[PDB]
Amino acid sequence: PLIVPYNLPLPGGVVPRMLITILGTVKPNANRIALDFQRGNDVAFHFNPRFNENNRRVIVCNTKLDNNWGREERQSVFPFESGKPFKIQVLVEPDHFKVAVNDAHLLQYNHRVKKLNEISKLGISGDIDLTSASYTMI
Ligand SMILES: CO[C@@H]1[C@@H](n2cc(-c3ccc(Cl)c(F)c3F)nn2)[C@@H](O)[C@@H](CO)O[C@@H]1Cc1cn([C@H]2CCOC[C@@H]2F)nn1
Numbered sequence: 001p002l003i004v005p006y007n008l009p010l011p012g013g014v015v016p017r018m019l020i021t022i023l024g025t026v027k028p029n030a031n032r033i034a035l036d037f038q039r040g041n042d043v044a045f046h047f048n049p050r051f052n053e054n055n056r057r058v059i060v061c062n063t064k065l066d067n068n069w070g071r072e073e074r075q076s077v078f079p080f081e082s083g084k085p086f087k088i089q090v091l092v093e094p095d096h097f098k099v100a101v102n103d104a105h106l107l108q109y110n111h112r113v114k115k116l117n118e119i120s121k122l123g124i125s126g127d128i129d130l131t132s133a134s135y136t137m138i
Helices: none
Strands: 006-009 018-026 033-039 042-053 056-065 073-075 085-092 096-101 104-110 121-126 128-137
Touching (some): 018 121, 033 085, 056 104, 073 104, 121 128
Antiparallel strands (some): 006 121, 018 085, 018 128, 033 042, 033 121, 042 056, 056 073, 096 104
């Protein structure tokens, strides 16, 4: 295991065809997970599984600019289960981040932050046991 929160450097930011893989286990009584792809203090892509928002499980995605959250993009398709080993894969494409969980496509999120080569950190936080975080080019 690795201790959460964890910062994964993304040197020289991201680029199309870069695949970022996060492996871990969801804690048994999990409430929340967050991935924060950051450009300095801005959050280009915040991917936020919520296990109990008004008794529903939802994925919330957004962008934070100058410390202000933007318009939320939401998904009720919710592939995580408490207590289980997961894999989140974020593939950077030219116009969006594409997310698959456990080898099943989940969602796309259009790039709001345009300076891909400045999105130089992935913060990983919340109710997980983190096994590894890495990247490759496809
Ligand atoms: C409660 O904070 C979350 C944010 N958040 C969540 C976390 C976090 C912290 C720690 C761990 Cl361990 C962890 F998993 C985490 F998710 N930190 N900040 C974030 O999820 C944003 C995503 O939009 O929503 C909330 C904040 C929020 C949303 N809105 C509006 C935006 C326009 O639409 C209507 C909304 F009201 N204004 N503020």
